[PDB]
Amino acid sequence: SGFRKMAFPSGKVEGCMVQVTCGTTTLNGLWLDDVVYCPRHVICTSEDMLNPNYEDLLIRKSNHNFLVQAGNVQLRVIGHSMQNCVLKLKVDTANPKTPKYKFVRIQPGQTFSVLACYNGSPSGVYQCAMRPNFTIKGSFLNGSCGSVGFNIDYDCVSFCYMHHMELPTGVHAGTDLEGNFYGPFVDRQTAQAAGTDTTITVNVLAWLYAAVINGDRWFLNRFTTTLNDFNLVAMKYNYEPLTQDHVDILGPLSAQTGIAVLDMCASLKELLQNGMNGRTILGSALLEDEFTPFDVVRQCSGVT
Amino acid sequence: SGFRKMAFPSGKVEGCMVQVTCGTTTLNGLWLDDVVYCPRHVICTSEDMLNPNYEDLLIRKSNHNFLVQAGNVQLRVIGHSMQNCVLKLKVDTANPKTPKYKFVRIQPGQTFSVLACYNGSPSGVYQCAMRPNFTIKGSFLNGSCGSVGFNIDYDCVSFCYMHHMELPTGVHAGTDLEGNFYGPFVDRQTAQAAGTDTTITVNVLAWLYAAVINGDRWFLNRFTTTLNDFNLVAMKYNYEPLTQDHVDILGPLSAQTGIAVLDMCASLKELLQNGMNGRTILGSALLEDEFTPFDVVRQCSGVT
Ligand SMILES: O=C(Nc1cncc2ccccc12)[C@@H]1CCNc2ccc(Cl)cc21
Ligand SMILES: O=C(Nc1cncc2ccccc12)[C@@H]1CCNc2ccc(Cl)cc21
């Protein structure tokens, strides 16, 4: 028992981190097979970021201007291309530590682990979620660009995020490994404000199920509700609307605890309306929404 | 910016995890050089746990009764010894992935990363702290025994914890890598209740400094206090007494923000007395105490 914000073991991804320098900009790259992936803004100076024309800027760059260093050995760059907001640097050597991998574009509400890196070296690993407003609440400093987000299924690493920027609000924006930003963000030093950060209802319910499994049962009440009644309350509290798809996905947690999904919705509805009254759930004084139903089942069953 | 409960990259420790089976009990072991470390309760059946005499039980075990499997290849056991509550299994092969390492015994209030494992395979990584009552609030299921806690300083892994048991309250107890339990716990299936879980004051102040650095400044007030006045309030709220050593350790955070330590104590004192009033600090509705001053400086500077 016990419930923690757990990240995937990062070893498979640490073996892929390299440093990419172009001129005076140094950031991280991801080395898979003979290709190094990195944010295209590695070719920019801070002055270029105001209004960069990446195609024009890239014309003044050759293979030898991209310095790729893995550990402490230099990789030879034999090709470069821009795909959306990422640069793919073809190196002459395949990464011998390349794990089995996929590039996936995740949906908001989905969680992933981030291995924060600086100068191609890992500093830490943490778990976060793609927010409904397509930002992530990460922990990134200058130089962290190119750090990646991923999930692991047994031996396959599904890369889903590459870090590109921090918005003035301290939230983070980035792309999938094809270079497409999550949300409406653009890799430019301009006024970009995040939209409403709504709460991921299905995740909060999964975490309520995790609390029941781990012994925290005080919030269970004698009520039930309907999807429509629950959603009237959820909209008022800037919670995402709950769908039958979400109820279906919560099925295994409902089966394990014997608490019907709509009964858990009524419990959540009362927690929204009455607050916690100074109490905690799984050591938290707020409703946690960065654990998916899959994460709860995984953590409570011990998938390796 | 952004502040997350960050764990160390786990790769160096993943390369050390093996599976140890003795009879019908399977748990995890740590393979460093030619020695595999594991909880001595691997030699027990659940019936033995009621009142085990480990010396007597170990007499009926030979080298060939300890099955050590690294990945999917069997290691040959050429010696075994009991040191306190751990077994050291001498294997004929040194772990080729052994990182630079130390065995350290940590003090309460110190934080570390745990790589939770099942059948010698990593499932996840999370950060936690040695509580003042010598328990840890982990996330461990049956089979997780032998999972380790560690810190990394550049390339050196300081192993500090080996997981042994879960108390009836859902908190966890374990040993340092010399087999000595943290706290008064014994590896026996008996009535062991944890003591008062006090809050690590120095860590809460470090996290208040992290919040100021990351923009959350609403809790800063116009007051100051003294160590004695602050400690009168801290005792009332089951917070550890703050010492001049703690003030000294908070010095770099005080310098970075320009907020004197005793002024931050007055802010904390008001937060204890008045509560949060429905507000949050670094996305939390409670005062977080599992970040040391070293962790705050590390995360805010990007040590790799
Ligand atoms: O955001 C960026 N980098 C960072 C990323 N994460 C956390 C940071 C913390 C502190 C300083 C920088 C950080 C970069 C540089 C600033 N301007 C800018 C504009 C557009 C793009 Cl695509 C990238 C950037
Ligand atoms: O605590 C133990 N294991 C576990 C450890 N962590 C989380 C667990 C969750 C669920 C089931 C077991 C868990 C073991 C078995 C039970 N009794 C026992 C008594 C003494 C000692 Cl030293 C070990 C043990």
Side-chain angles (χ1 to χ4, degrees), chain B residues 41 49 140-142 144-145 163-166 187 189:
Chain B
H41 73 252
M49 295 314 297
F140 293 113
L141 306 166
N142 209 118
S144 63
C145 302
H163 186 52
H164 288 240
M165 56 170 207
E166 178 172 87
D187 48 3
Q189 180 53 53

Side-chain angles (χ1 to χ4, degrees), chain A residues 27-42:
Chain A
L27 46 57
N28 309 282
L30 188 67
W31 183 23
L32 295 168
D33 298 327
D34 60 349
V35 180
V36 174
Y37 302 85
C38 78
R40 61 174 186 178
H41 73 252
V42 71

Side-chain angles (χ1 to χ4, degrees), chain A residues 142-264:
Chain A
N142 209 118
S144 63
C145 302
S147 294
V148 299
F150 62 93
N151 285 275
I152 310 175
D153 190 28
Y154 174 57
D155 61 347
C156 186
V157 183
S158 277
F159 292 102
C160 61
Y161 177 84
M162 177 167 273
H163 186 52
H164 288 240
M165 56 170 207
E166 178 172 87
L167 299 163
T169 49
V171 292
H172 305 107
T175 70
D176 59 26
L177 272 300
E178 289 176 342
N180 298 114
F181 264 89
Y182 281 100
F185 309 107
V186 302
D187 48 3
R188 198 182 313 138
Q189 180 53 53
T190 207
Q192 310 181 50
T196 303
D197 199 2
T198 64
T199 305
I200 311 141
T201 313
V202 67
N203 289 6
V204 174
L205 291 165
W207 169 91
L208 289 181
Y209 277 115
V212 166
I213 289 161
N214 291 305
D216 277 28
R217 314 165 60 104
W218 68 264
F219 58 84
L220 294 182
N221 62 37
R222 306 182 157 274
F223 324 130
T224 204
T225 186
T226 61
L227 263 196
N228 291 160
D229 178 57
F230 177 77
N231 288 334
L232 283 188
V233 174
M235 174 160 54
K236 179 173 130 72
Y237 287 93
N238 283 132
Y239 265 59
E240 286 285 292
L242 199 70
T243 69
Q244 186 56 48
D245 277 14
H246 293 143
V247 175
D248 292 340
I249 282 163
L250 294 164
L253 284 176
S254 178
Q256 190 173 340
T257 56
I259 293 161
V261 173
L262 289 176
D263 291 6
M264 190 69 86

Side-chain angles (χ1 to χ4, degrees), chain A residues 6 53 97 115 126 162 175 248 270 285:
Chain A
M6 196 183 278
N53 187 310
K97 309 184 194 161
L115 178 62
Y126 52 86
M162 177 167 273
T175 70
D248 292 340
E270 300 294 298

Side-chain angles (χ1 to χ4, degrees), chain B residues 33-289:
Chain B
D33 298 327
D34 60 349
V35 180
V36 174
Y37 302 85
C38 78
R40 61 174 186 178
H41 73 252
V42 71
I43 73 176
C44 304
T45 69
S46 28
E47 185 177 5
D48 288 331
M49 295 314 297
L50 311 178
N51 195 17
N53 187 310
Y54 289 96
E55 261 289 304
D56 293 347
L57 284 182
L58 198 54
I59 284 169
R60 313 297 152 182
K61 306 299 188 180
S62 304
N63 291 333
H64 70 264
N65 295 126
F66 297 99
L67 301 175
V68 182
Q69 195 178 318
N72 257 84
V73 308
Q74 214 65 22
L75 293 176
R76 184 176 302 280
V77 184
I78 61 167
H80 69 274
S81 65
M82 179 163 67
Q83 181 178 16
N84 304 305
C85 306
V86 298
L87 297 185
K88 294 189 299 202
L89 305 180
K90 206 204 190 178
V91 288
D92 72 350
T93 303
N95 184 356
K97 309 184 194 161
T98 309
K100 290 176 180 177
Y101 73 94
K102 288 180 178 180
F103 289 170
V104 298
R105 178 174 183 85
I106 61 158
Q107 294 293 303
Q110 299 298 113
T111 60
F112 57 87
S113 297
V114 171
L115 178 62
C117 300
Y118 299 93
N119 303 113
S121 289
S123 66
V125 51
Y126 52 86
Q127 190 81 350
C128 55
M130 180 53 57
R131 301 310 308 176
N133 66 5
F134 298 100
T135 62
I136 78 166
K137 295 221 180 96
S139 178
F140 293 113
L141 306 166
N142 209 118
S144 63
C145 302
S147 294
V148 299
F150 62 93
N151 285 275
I152 310 175
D153 190 28
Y154 174 57
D155 61 347
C156 186
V157 183
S158 277
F159 292 102
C160 61
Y161 177 84
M162 177 167 273
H163 186 52
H164 288 240
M165 56 170 207
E166 178 172 87
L167 299 163
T169 49
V171 292
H172 305 107
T175 70
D176 59 26
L177 272 300
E178 289 176 342
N180 298 114
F181 264 89
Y182 281 100
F185 309 107
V186 302
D187 48 3
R188 198 182 313 138
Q189 180 53 53
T190 207
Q192 310 181 50
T196 303
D197 199 2
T198 64
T199 305
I200 311 141
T201 313
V202 67
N203 289 6
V204 174
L205 291 165
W207 169 91
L208 289 181
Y209 277 115
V212 166
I213 289 161
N214 291 305
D216 277 28
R217 314 165 60 104
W218 68 264
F219 58 84
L220 294 182
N221 62 37
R222 306 182 157 274
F223 324 130
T224 204
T225 186
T226 61
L227 263 196
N228 291 160
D229 178 57
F230 177 77
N231 288 334
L232 283 188
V233 174
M235 174 160 54
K236 179 173 130 72
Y237 287 93
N238 283 132
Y239 265 59
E240 286 285 292
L242 199 70
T243 69
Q244 186 56 48
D245 277 14
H246 293 143
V247 175
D248 292 340
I249 282 163
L250 294 164
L253 284 176
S254 178
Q256 190 173 340
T257 56
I259 293 161
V261 173
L262 289 176
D263 291 6
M264 190 69 86
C265 291
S267 281
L268 177 47
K269 164 175 159 200
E270 300 294 298
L271 278 171
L272 289 177
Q273 289 167 344
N274 307 332
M276 313 268 277
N277 288 118
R279 299 183 282 262
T280 61
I281 294 167
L282 291 172
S284 179
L286 53 77
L287 301 168
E288 301 282 320
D289 78 345

